[PDB]
Amino acid sequence: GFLVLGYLLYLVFGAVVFSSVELPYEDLLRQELRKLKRRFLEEHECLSEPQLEQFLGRVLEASNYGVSVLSNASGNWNWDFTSALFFASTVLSTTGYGHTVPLSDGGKAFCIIYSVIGIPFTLLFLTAVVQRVTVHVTRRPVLYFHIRWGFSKQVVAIVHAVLLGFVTVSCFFFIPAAVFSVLEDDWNFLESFYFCFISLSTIGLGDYVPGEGYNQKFRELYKIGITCYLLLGLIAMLVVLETFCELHELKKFRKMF
Amino acid sequence: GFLVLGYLLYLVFGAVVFSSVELPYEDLLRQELRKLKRRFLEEHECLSEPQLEQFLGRVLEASNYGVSVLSNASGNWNWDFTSALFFASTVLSTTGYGHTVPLSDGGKAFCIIYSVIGIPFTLLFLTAVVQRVTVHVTRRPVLYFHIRWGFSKQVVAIVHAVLLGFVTVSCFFFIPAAVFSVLEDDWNFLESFYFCFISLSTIGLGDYVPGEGYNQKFRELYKIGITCYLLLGLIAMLVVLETFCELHELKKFRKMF
Ligand SMILES: CCCCCCCC
Ligand SMILES: CCCCCCCC
Ligand SMILES: [K+]
Ligand SMILES: [K+]
Ligand SMILES: [K+]
Ligand SMILES: [K+]
Ligand SMILES: [K+]
Structure with missing residues (x-):
């Protein structure tokens, strides 16, 4: 009741703030992409608007x-063993980047059947x-802390579980953000952090996808390394989210709302 | 151990079958899209490959x-109140269709912050x-069945929970598939069923997105109706998946693996 209105209010608050910040940039890019449309068309006088409209439609x-x-x-x-292994990891993990999806009526039908039991x-x-x-990573440190210092078990878990998230966050965001900033030359650090957040969160927006290097040297080992990193991130944020859900403070919030 | 190998084997089985079915179609489309590249370029002799490569890059x-x-x-x-309300529902629900994403450095930063607490x-x-x-929908029928017929409570839930999924499946797939097949003229029934599966499943591949009708009559009411349907589907498959997870048979499978 109260929450549902709040959630609806929250999206309303979300939509206005994006309209306040994103939309001017989007109006700028949509104004400048429409400018790009008219520059590209102006340059190619031979080229005409409708046929191009059909071509871009396809x-x-x-x-x-x-x-x-x-x-x-x-x-x-x-679709090759590695890339298909990546599509299948993403569609099974729900990320769904959209860089690869089924192209046929039969192919779609298998993907549904494959994803009804696969997911x-x-x-x-x-x-x-x-x-x-x-x-291992979360339970073992908590046990060591209580025994060595001897304070109550109830208070050590709640206070120090928060501490263990920072370890995971840095291990899977900051250091990987630097790694991705090194492997992908055309990325900055902010876009890499954005990509790591969306991928691990499972949003899989698909605006940032690795492995696009033009005839890059290690496409197969790199596609499988990124696959392994994306599962590893999914496991480590399902551990962080399991621990935050376990936390008494967050649990109370769920009970309240 | 055994499962992890099986899961890796399962993707390997997935990658070969997609290579067996999807890849020939993809090779066909990639052969025919490359054909489209050379038809479009052949038609526009004025137009040249590199500048076009940059233009399509953008x-x-x-x-x-x-x-x-x-x-x-x-x-x-x-980005308008309705469309932004839709982007925020999708990014919060993890669907992440990719039809709308942040375009700026500042915009991305808010989306992360918005999605750290939003999700x-x-x-x-x-x-x-x-x-x-x-x-309501699932628990109430089960109670009625046991009282009227008098058989054991343990056996009614497991056998008839499966029956209640078919009701939800038809209500949220077949009838909506027909509805979408009516509102979207350029879709068939198979693509609509595919879109409903991916959206409710949360994959959000983004190859099928509603509301793209060119200056269609009810863009605002339609974008909010599709938003409400997409939450409704998410709620009804989190109910179906909660009940399947509750099922003794599926639960045993999880325990085994
Ligand atoms: C493809 C990566 C598999 C990682 C398995 C880790 C098991 C502890
Ligand atoms: C925008 C759709 C809201 C649906 C709320 C349903 C509450 C039972
Ligand atoms: K997704
Ligand atoms: K996507
Ligand atoms: K996409
Ligand atoms: K998802
Ligand atoms: K997605």
């Missing part, structure tokens, strides 16, 4: 569908893998 | 970033709303 449909028209088309194979199986996989890590 | 970057270059650019406002708050919202529905 090109962007495909792009939405995954088949980037970039790299002379002979760029990276959207529950993958939730089982991530939950089991997450459960192991909680015993 | 156009598809923006498209990834959300600003579709379609509808003379003056199409729908990516946990939204998980709280969906969980609370889901919890209410379970008491």
